Design a binder for these strands. Sequence first.
DNA 1: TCGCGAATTCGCG
DNA 2: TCGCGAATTCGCG
Lengths: 261, 261
Amino acid sequence: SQGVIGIFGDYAKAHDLAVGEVSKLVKKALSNEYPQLSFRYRDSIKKTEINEALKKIDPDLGGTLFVSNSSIKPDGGIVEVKDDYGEWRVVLVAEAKHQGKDIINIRNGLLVGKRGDQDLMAAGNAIDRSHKNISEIANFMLSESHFPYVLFLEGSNFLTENISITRPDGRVVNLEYNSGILNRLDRLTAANYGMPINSNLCINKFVNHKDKSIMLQAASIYTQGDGREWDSKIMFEIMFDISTTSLRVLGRDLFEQLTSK
Amino acid sequence: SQGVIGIFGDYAKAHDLAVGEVSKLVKKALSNEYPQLSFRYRDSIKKTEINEALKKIDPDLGGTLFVSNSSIKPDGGIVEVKDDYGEWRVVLVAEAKHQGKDIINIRNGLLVGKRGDQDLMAAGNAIDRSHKNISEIANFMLSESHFPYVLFLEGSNFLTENISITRPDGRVVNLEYNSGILNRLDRLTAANYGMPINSNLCINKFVNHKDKSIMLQAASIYTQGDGREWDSKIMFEIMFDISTTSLRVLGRDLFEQLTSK
DNA sequence: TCGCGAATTCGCG
DNA sequence: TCGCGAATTCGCG
């Protein structure tokens, strides 16, 4: 709670900064707050890197590639920091997804459906893709104790409250939030193991079962619950919060740089 | 290696059985081989179940649902067995995916692309969806030591060798296997942590890092490497193999039923 | 070049 | 009914 983020946030709002530009601005704020630490922003990671990180855990892992310069490209990029051993440690990965143009149709008068008949459109499964990148960055961070992955959802397919949109003929159509003809929110909940959405799940839980002990890598899933678009200021504050808690977890491998610089 | 599967396999080939009907036939073979064990086949699992399995690991897990009767429906169903405590243990989950209709276009004469110009079509990312279900059944089986998930890939987007298709005008067009304009095989490799495709990865590896010890749940990804469709006999034999090794892992909780029945 | 992402309508039980 | 899956063309750097 250092005040400087109040100025940064109002900058984002004053410019309608998308997720990618907000993560770039988060890097700026971080280096402003921690001037002796070294941050950077990437817009992609190559599969070779991920595989290289994998076989460092176990020799039999990470031994596959079919397209040589294949890569993943989170539309909000990766913010990293440099630790005391010169290694780069990811402190933020962000992505922003959209589904369900229903509120647009109902705001206007366009009747959708197979025969121009429907008010609503049966929600599709495109949002299932979001699990691939989460898997990639999870495997990338399989040796870290923090998973700083933030997903930002938007659209009529991601409602957490009931909303009423009125047509150009006075017709109030109602979007019922828990309706399985619209709500695709459940399609993401496997990523944080059914832990709460709209919350920062950055620090990894360790759960057991038998002698079977294991680590969970949960993603932070945030929803514009009322159908509207995201406020860049809030989007910014969330990312700053998830990145700082990442820095808290990295605190051991950052000490030298912070005390002697 | 009990012979009976030779007859079963030739049955599948003689009928072109899709993945779902092959898994149903696998159940039949299993109960034929293990007549004192109790198997069953489901075609879906409800999110409530998955959440119920999750909070059995940790109280804070599995506490989310937005659509009440939301479910997942692997197009090859789930084969289970009943253990000595009356509990049902999944021994097989199978799914079959398709991408890249290129070999059809080149077999015929249809030039694709924005202006009816191209021989090839730039491969899309629909195959990324396959990670959701893998996540769901992984969370479902987070307390098991075996992950019996088999994925069957088919299409010009999943080639492991170079193939040559000749047009109705003598034109040999060549599909180069490691071409990143066609090959989407890398889009699955996060599921088995870069371990070998076309192999049975059913038994879970335990890898460490610090004191940080963890369990990996790797999916079996099989490819029709030469673009063609799957032979139901082989598809069958693979599923039977992955399911039996599942039974091997369950061997402790199955003893009573096998010795006293 | 090459390789990555976007998220869509609608069928089906 | 309601809710799940299918996998597609093509833009963009």
